[PDB]
């Protein structure tokens, strides 16, 4: 199918249901459809910089928008979690993060913060010619990784060169962002990882208020150490 009804659109864009008959369908890209933010909604229905899709198209042909340091001209380009949107004409850098409500919240960041992003390690394996590499949550293949990097770790990637500057292991006491379930957008420190082999691993997380909640490991993204996040939080 090539058409998406506004009501049938998943929940997280915050789009009003009655604006029109159809909503933008995210195109193929780094992120899955159900957790992506196409540039049209980000520019029009969140920032309001544009009033209509045609104005958005003029904006993108002007090459004023950069996603992760690269100019994108597709209106429905699927920006997602830990994506840096740079607007040089106006001097803004934005990082896409879920809010406690579970919507993407437009968070201003510094240029140093813009220069890098964080990627959860989804897979680590040896490529052709015996070259190890890592696949992150955004589909980025990075070769010659540090040996200590494993699955469920988080790697700090420099956008300009796309290389690994530092990494965080998945361990108890680490600071964590929830990217799914009811707890989506919540932040807390790991307590215990409960393992079911052949099944979905479960992680217990305690917030700063001492409240505890359990979530599947797939919705877990390490973002730093307790009290020392590597990214600016909303």
């Amino acid at each position: 199918k090539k058409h998406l009804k506004r009501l049938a659109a998943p929940h997280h864009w915050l789009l009003d249901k009655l604006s029109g008959c159809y909503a933008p369908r995210p195109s193929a890209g780094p992120h899955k459809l159900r957790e992506s933010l196409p540039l049209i909604v980000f520019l029009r229905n969140r920032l309001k910089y544009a009033l209509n899709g045609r104005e958005v198209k003029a904006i993108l042909m002007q090459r004023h928008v950069k996603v992760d340091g690269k100019v994108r001209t597709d209106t429905t380009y699927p920006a997602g979690f830990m994506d840096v949107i740079t607007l040089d004409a106006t001097n803004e850098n934005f990082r896409l993060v879920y809010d406690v409500k579970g919507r993407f919240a437009v968070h201003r960041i510094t240029d140093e913060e813009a220069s890098y992003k964080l990627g959860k390690v989804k897979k680590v394996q040896l490529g052709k010619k015996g070259v190890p590499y890592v696949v992150t949550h955004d589909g980025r293949t990075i070769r010659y990784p540090d040996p200590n990097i494993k699955v469920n770790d988080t790697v700090k990637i420099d956008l300009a060169s796309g290389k690994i500057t530092d990494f965080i292991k998945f361990d108890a006491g680490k600071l964590v962002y929830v990217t799914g379930g009811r707890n989506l957008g919540r932040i807390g420190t790991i307590v215990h990882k409960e393992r079911h082999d052949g099944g979905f691993d479960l992680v217990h997380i305690k917030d700063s208020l001492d409240n505890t909640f359990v979530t599947r490991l797939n919705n877990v993204f390490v973002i730093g150490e307790q009290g020392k996040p590597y990214i600016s939080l909303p």
Binding site: H11, K101, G180, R182
Partner: peptide
């Protein structure tokens, strides 16, 4: 078995 699926009706306000 736990479904582990978000539900829109639970989040949305039902005050009216």
């Amino acid at each position: 078995h736990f479904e582990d699926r978000f539900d829109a009706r639970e989040h949305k306000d039902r005050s009216n």
